[PDB]
Design an enzyme around this catalytic site. Sequence first.
Site, PDB file in Angstrom:
ATOM      1  N   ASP D  71     -13.388  -9.530  -2.170  1.00 56.81           N
ATOM      2  CA  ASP D  71     -12.617  -8.993  -3.360  1.00 56.81           C
ATOM      3  C   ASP D  71     -13.355  -9.077  -4.582  1.00 56.81           C
ATOM      4  O   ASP D  71     -13.356  -8.050  -5.345  1.00 56.81           O
ATOM      5  CB  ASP D  71     -11.131  -9.688  -3.516  1.00 56.81           C
ATOM      6  CG  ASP D  71     -10.357  -8.524  -4.432  1.00 56.81           C
ATOM      7  OD1 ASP D  71     -10.516  -8.069  -5.592  1.00 56.81           O
ATOM      8  OD2 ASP D  71      -9.313  -7.826  -3.603  1.00 56.81           O
ATOM      9  N   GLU D 198      -1.386  -4.996 -10.320  1.00 53.98           N
ATOM     10  CA  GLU D 198      -1.912  -3.631  -9.634  1.00 53.98           C
ATOM     11  C   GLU D 198      -0.807  -2.460  -9.955  1.00 53.98           C
ATOM     12  O   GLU D 198      -0.323  -1.919  -9.093  1.00 53.98           O
ATOM     13  CB  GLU D 198      -2.153  -3.627  -8.112  1.00 53.98           C
ATOM     14  CG  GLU D 198      -2.954  -4.990  -8.083  1.00 53.98           C
ATOM     15  CD  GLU D 198      -3.463  -4.945  -6.488  1.00 53.98           C
ATOM     16  OE1 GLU D 198      -2.661  -5.045  -5.606  1.00 53.98           O
ATOM     17  OE2 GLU D 198      -4.805  -5.374  -6.149  1.00 53.98           O
ATOM     18  N   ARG D 214       3.230  -4.679  -8.170  1.00 52.41           N
ATOM     19  CA  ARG D 214       3.485  -5.519  -7.075  1.00 52.41           C
ATOM     20  C   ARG D 214       3.854  -6.875  -7.845  1.00 52.41           C
ATOM     21  O   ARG D 214       2.978  -7.438  -8.300  1.00 52.41           O
ATOM     22  CB  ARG D 214       2.209  -5.533  -6.260  1.00 52.41           C
ATOM     23  CG  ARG D 214       1.741  -6.767  -5.425  1.00 52.41           C
ATOM     24  CD  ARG D 214       0.379  -6.548  -4.957  1.00 52.41           C
ATOM     25  NE  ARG D 214       0.060  -7.523  -4.034  1.00 52.41           N
ATOM     26  CZ  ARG D 214      -1.096  -7.592  -3.277  1.00 52.41           C
ATOM     27  NH1 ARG D 214      -2.162  -6.769  -3.370  1.00 52.41           N
ATOM     28  NH2 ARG D 214      -1.502  -8.540  -2.557  1.00 52.41           N
ATOM     29  N   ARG D 297       0.602  -3.474   6.972  1.00 54.31           N
ATOM     30  CA  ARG D 297       0.104  -2.431   6.186  1.00 54.31           C
ATOM     31  C   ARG D 297      -0.375  -1.229   7.373  1.00 54.31           C
ATOM     32  O   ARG D 297      -1.436  -1.173   7.227  1.00 54.31           O
ATOM     33  CB  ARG D 297      -0.832  -2.894   5.373  1.00 54.31           C
ATOM     34  CG  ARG D 297      -0.723  -3.983   4.324  1.00 54.31           C
ATOM     35  CD  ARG D 297      -1.978  -4.520   3.578  1.00 54.31           C
ATOM     36  NE  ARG D 297      -1.548  -5.270   2.443  1.00 54.31           N
ATOM     37  CZ  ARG D 297      -2.554  -5.620   1.605  1.00 54.31           C
ATOM     38  NH1 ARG D 297      -4.068  -5.227   1.580  1.00 54.31           N
ATOM     39  NH2 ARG D 297      -2.098  -6.304   0.549  1.00 54.31           N
ATOM     40  N   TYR D 331      -3.594   0.282  -0.174  1.00 50.07           N
ATOM     41  CA  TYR D 331      -3.165   0.647  -1.600  1.00 50.07           C
ATOM     42  C   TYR D 331      -2.620   2.049  -1.418  1.00 50.07           C
ATOM     43  O   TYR D 331      -3.151   2.970  -0.809  1.00 50.07           O
ATOM     44  CB  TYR D 331      -4.276   0.473  -2.702  1.00 50.07           C
ATOM     45  CG  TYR D 331      -4.537  -1.024  -2.923  1.00 50.07           C
ATOM     46  CD1 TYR D 331      -3.804  -2.173  -2.121  1.00 50.07           C
ATOM     47  CD2 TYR D 331      -5.210  -1.623  -4.013  1.00 50.07           C
ATOM     48  CE1 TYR D 331      -4.002  -3.570  -2.587  1.00 50.07           C
ATOM     49  CE2 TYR D 331      -5.461  -2.981  -4.289  1.00 50.07           C
ATOM     50  CZ  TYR D 331      -4.751  -3.826  -3.384  1.00 50.07           C
ATOM     51  OH  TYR D 331      -4.920  -5.410  -3.626  1.00 50.07           O
TER      52      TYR D 331
END
Lengths: 389, 389, 389, 389
Positions: D71, D198, D214, D297, D331
């Site tokens: 990240d 976010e 979020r 996800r 996302y």
Amino acid sequence: EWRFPKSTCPGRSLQKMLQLNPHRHATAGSQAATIPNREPFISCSQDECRLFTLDHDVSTPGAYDGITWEDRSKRRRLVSFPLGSELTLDNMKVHLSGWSGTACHDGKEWTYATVNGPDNSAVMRLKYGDQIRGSFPSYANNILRTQESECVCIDGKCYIIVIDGPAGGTATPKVLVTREGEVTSEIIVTGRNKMGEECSCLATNRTWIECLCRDNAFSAKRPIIRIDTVAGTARGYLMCSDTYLDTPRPADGSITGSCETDGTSGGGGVKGAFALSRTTEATTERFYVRTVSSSARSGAVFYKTTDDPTESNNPLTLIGTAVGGAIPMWYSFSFEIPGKVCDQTCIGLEMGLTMGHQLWTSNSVAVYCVIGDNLDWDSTTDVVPADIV
Amino acid sequence: EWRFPKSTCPGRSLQKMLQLNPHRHATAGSQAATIPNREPFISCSQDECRLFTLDHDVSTPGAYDGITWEDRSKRRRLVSFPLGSELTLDNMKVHLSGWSGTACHDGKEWTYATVNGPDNSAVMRLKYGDQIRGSFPSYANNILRTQESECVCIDGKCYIIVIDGPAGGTATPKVLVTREGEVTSEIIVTGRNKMGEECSCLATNRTWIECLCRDNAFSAKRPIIRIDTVAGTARGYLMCSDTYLDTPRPADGSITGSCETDGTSGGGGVKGAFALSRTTEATTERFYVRTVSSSARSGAVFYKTTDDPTESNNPLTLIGTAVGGAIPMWYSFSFEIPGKVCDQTCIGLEMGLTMGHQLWTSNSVAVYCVIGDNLDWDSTTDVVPADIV
Amino acid sequence: EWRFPKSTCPGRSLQKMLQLNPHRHATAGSQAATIPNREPFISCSQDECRLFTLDHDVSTPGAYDGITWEDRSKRRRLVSFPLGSELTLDNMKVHLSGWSGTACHDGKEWTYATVNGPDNSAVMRLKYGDQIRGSFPSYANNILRTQESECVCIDGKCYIIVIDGPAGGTATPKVLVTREGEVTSEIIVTGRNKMGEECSCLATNRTWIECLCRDNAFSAKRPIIRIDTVAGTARGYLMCSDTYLDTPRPADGSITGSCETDGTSGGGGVKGAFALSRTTEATTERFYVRTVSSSARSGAVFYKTTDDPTESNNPLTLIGTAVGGAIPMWYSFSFEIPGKVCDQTCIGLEMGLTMGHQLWTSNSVAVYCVIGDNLDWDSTTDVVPADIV
Amino acid sequence: EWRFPKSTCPGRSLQKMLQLNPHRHATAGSQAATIPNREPFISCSQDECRLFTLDHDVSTPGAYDGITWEDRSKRRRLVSFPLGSELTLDNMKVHLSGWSGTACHDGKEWTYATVNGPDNSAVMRLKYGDQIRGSFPSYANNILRTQESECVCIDGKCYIIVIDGPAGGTATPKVLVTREGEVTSEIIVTGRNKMGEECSCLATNRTWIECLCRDNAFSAKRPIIRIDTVAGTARGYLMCSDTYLDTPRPADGSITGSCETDGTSGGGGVKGAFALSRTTEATTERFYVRTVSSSARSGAVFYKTTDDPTESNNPLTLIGTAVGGAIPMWYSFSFEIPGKVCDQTCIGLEMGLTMGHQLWTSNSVAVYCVIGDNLDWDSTTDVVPADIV
Ligand SMILES: *[C@@H]1O[C@H](CO)[C@@H](O)[C@H](O)[C@H]1NC(C)=O
Ligand SMILES: *[C@@H]1O[C@H](CO)[C@@H](O)[C@H](O)[C@H]1NC(C)=O
Ligand SMILES: *[C@@H]1O[C@H](CO)[C@@H](O)[C@H](O)[C@H]1NC(C)=O
Ligand SMILES: *[C@@H]1O[C@H](CO)[C@@H](O)[C@H](O)[C@H]1NC(C)=O
Ligand SMILES: [Ca+2]
Ligand SMILES: [Ca+2]
Ligand SMILES: [Ca+2]
Ligand SMILES: [Ca+2]
């Protein structure tokens, strides 16, 4: 209309803008034709900023890229890339052949200058827009060369420092004054003027320019040249701070004598850079870079001062380490981003990449600008030259 | 508004601008799709300069690039690149199909012209901006062809030299006069007009054009064509200097007879070029190129004169060698860089690269412009055709 | 301001402009990522011309390029390239997802339209500048599809032919009328309106449009649709000439009956194209293309006529062969180049390239425009699909 | 002049615009250097739309691309591509180094912002045009981070949500108010303000902004922040609908308690997005996305409502599935396309591609905009990560 120096954006430190690292894309399996290069620098118009550098008429990976260690050859050109474009073949723009370069925008047109020719009779040609408008021949017949960073344009005239003469002895710099690329005068540098290579130059106010240079023969202190563009004069000084900025150098404060005393070592050097804060009338803060090591070109450390660097021996104040001491750091350069409201000065860092003596040589470029209150992060390359194909 | 000839930038010699060398990037391990090409030339608007050339619908390295030796085929196109962009697939712009080309900007739009079709009934089409506005058919039905360098536009009309007829005999040139790409008249070339291929053309003052051409059948002296654009007339001459400019050629001064005497050899030739200095009223100096060798296409040497080349037999004055005699040198071309204050003329040099007879063929392009006082440096390619993959 | 039809540039024939052939660069050893595609066409604003086509979300060479034979899938997009740029990954611009496309410039903005979705409920979306301003759903729920060539914009409204319904039976076309990309009306096509796929459309004068279409079910004669943009009406006809333009087709003149008689064969077809000459009031000459073969999609031959194609059965007049009968020729398309003084119409030719049934499929595009007096040259690809890597 | 929110284009559903899928070109045999990336988003000026994302200073295929799962690192930069350009090295533009990003155009200039530095003392720098005009330091010293989607500019001020603090506990967001890139105030978020990462933000009328965020620690319901840009205030809410939008989440409606009750699970999350219809005075319809799966996800499903999301617990209304449940979906982001007549809002979808835990990681981006009456088609990638070379 014409470009002139404005007061700078508020800022009290150096923080990272961006980094370009083309040879990350030159590993096994990669599809990119990257451009090995050296002596890079940035110059900006009001529309765009550009990354300039001296290429070698070759891309990496490639069978001819073993020449990229040479300083001077018939293959080298001043090329440029829009700032933020990665350094690949398709993004490259060729401006002039030559092995020493500079460029600056005057508000209306780009001026590009390179030196071209054999060591003993080189010629600087200057390109204005699309035309070669100026030519300046070698006057000492021993490697005519220039700044390897942007020149400075004020009120339609651009100012360029050239030097010609031995790399290990006395070589006198001149200031060339150009209008639309034609050399219309030469300013004689008085004062301390026996050396002064690879000058990084910034306006200190509305009408004055300060250059930070490299003494390759006599001193670990950096020469400084100030130009009064109204009077048309230039004077050389020796940077007086106990925090010696060149590499190699002795320990801090140990050069005995006056401000302008050389000291006993002094052989060798590297191009250094600085950034600043200013109003229309005067410079209020200066920011300096030097290597972590005092004998090798590795690492980069930032400093600052509110003193006059030609008349105080106070140590500079530590900002922090921008490149760790285990990482090759070579040239650094100044530049200024013109804005509609305020201007901003910055330091770029040539993080060097090489396979060794007379083998493949190139770099990664990291950029820090005057903004904020503390240093934000150091930079790395994470390129292992052995992995370059 | 319209483009017209201005007085030129001061300059008394030729100095190197830049060089493009795409096939440096076509070696083992390289990632570039380079564009093999021949008959290149440069033309400029007031915004940009462009490198034009005739491609072969292929890139190198590549399995189809063995056709690049052919002069004429259904694969060839007039393409261009912004000047300074390297010659890769992604940078290329296709304008027109065809195997002979020219282009020039009139102040408002590009005119592009190519010849297309079989040898015995070729057609020149002219493109103006985006549209094909003109078409000119073959009139001798034996390889209609054109300049392979920029045309000249004055006051909204562009002037193009075409020739049609045998390569080893009498073939009469015509001047086409174009407005927005449409052929609106043909000027008959009077005087010495039995040959005149591949003309390099420059305005000599506000209203006159001078072309330097190639006689492929009769003479080592170069034909010259002068156009009076006001009167609408053109007259051919034979260049009179003892310094014969074509290749192959006999020794200097050894052609016996008048200015316009052919001499006994004269077979073969190569496209040559020139540059000049001028005011609005007259040309004050001329600059010429020829090969080092008098029998092979190798090397390039510069000369100058202040004489009228159609009426003096004085030798030209040596400037020096721009490409060493051991280096293939093929076509050269003239062009002019328009400026807001002054114009500048230049010579480009096609440094040829080939693996041999009917094998891979391409080039490197070096550019010299009128500026300065002495020649600055010679040019090389450092491309070994055997290393091209 | 708004785009409207002008009188055309003088011209009495078709001559070659240029050809794009990206897969010449997809052979062994090449470094290019070329873009396989089908159903290409060209559309122009007053600033630029662009090559549009439907891609497959893949490049060649490449492991996923085996899908390029499919007509419809979730991978296809309407993409474009500046006209003259070769068809490589870096040159490509993605506009909209979908498997049927059209585009046209109205004087101020691009309109882009594609159909997207499953066969039984597809949706046309229209993009105006950057925004999706219009959406038009399937009305027969059986492959809503459009022209695969440029639409026509007059006085701020753009006209698009869509069809929806069985490929081998009656499917009625509609004309969509768009303003800034929003569908503001639908014109019902009266008259002969039981088929009409893949229409190539050109203005015939200041206020009328003529489309040349493909009847896939009933006839070797091509349907023609005329639109009166002032009255807001459209009428379908069947092209009456004995020179049947579709493929496959019976021999010339052998369809017995009236102008609008289908004839007994008629199954299958290919998109055809035409070009024209016009004043502001009327069309003065028409130019048509068809294949060399009357049963296969191979070759291309040009014809012309000064007759009204909906009311004369006279054979058309031969111009000549533009693609030899041994060369695959698939779709062709009309387009118009707007100019400041005059407009020009052209025909593009999809020269097909494929390895076979459900294997790699793409094309080369050759362009011919209305200019000159005779056909100048035929076109080839010199691409052998077996050599594509 | 300045950008401000207009009423939106009519539209009652979401339909597909386009998809970018660079790693289709990174298979065996391909010639493209594609750019692996994460956290992408789109932002638009009135001239152009751009795809922004955080790169890793590397291309694929390539020996260094194994780091693309991280990240935060010294390699990451905010880069951008013109929208519709595929994501290759030559198309990329580097703006700022850093590992969290946002960008928005104010009518005159781009503002770019990234966070850079070590986890415990990161600094946000803001770039305005070419200059770094703003710097904002970490205030909780625990990963200062921002929206990973566009910010919103109204009347010359741009609004940015930052958060700083633990990923699994209370971390308070702030709204930064910027003018020409300089932070000129901070708005304290009142109300429900213990989380809010976010954020996807859109103006709800002429003077108000709504962000959908979020909660990574406490709730499967999404936090919502509303900003009144006139009063200079911001208030946090918890989205009240029974249709919980975060992943993972419990079954619909099963969180017992008030609107702002967390519920018992709530750990983890993903960035979500929304789109809307509005007049100058109020929002008339909202559109939401969530995953097909309530624990992984995967997949994406669209919903809508005309209710106020902070004060109704009614289920949202199903639009349909945009990405099948078998396809990784990570996302999603909001953005707005400014137009001269009307504005349009859209949702982008990060369709994730990875070889596994701490292996190669990237994405494909699909875009849906508010237009039409029904969902047109779902999206796929057809990229198998095993085939990436
Ligand atoms: C700039 O600085 C120089 C040196 O300090 C000074 O002489 C000059 O007056 C200054 N210029 C202005 C406009 O104040
Ligand atoms: C240009 O030169 C020609 C030939 O010497 C001459 O006749 C003409 O008058 C000149 N033009 C001008 C404007 O002086
Ligand atoms: C265009 O052609 C149509 C059909 O022939 C005719 O009715 C119309 O009047 C024409 N338009 C003009 C402006 O003459
Ligand atoms: C925008 O919405 C807010 C909240 O509903 C409201 O207070 C404000 O008046 C609205 N703005 C306008 C211009 O109507
Ligand atoms: Ca030193
Ligand atoms: Ca000869
Ligand atoms: Ca048919
Ligand atoms: Ca959660």
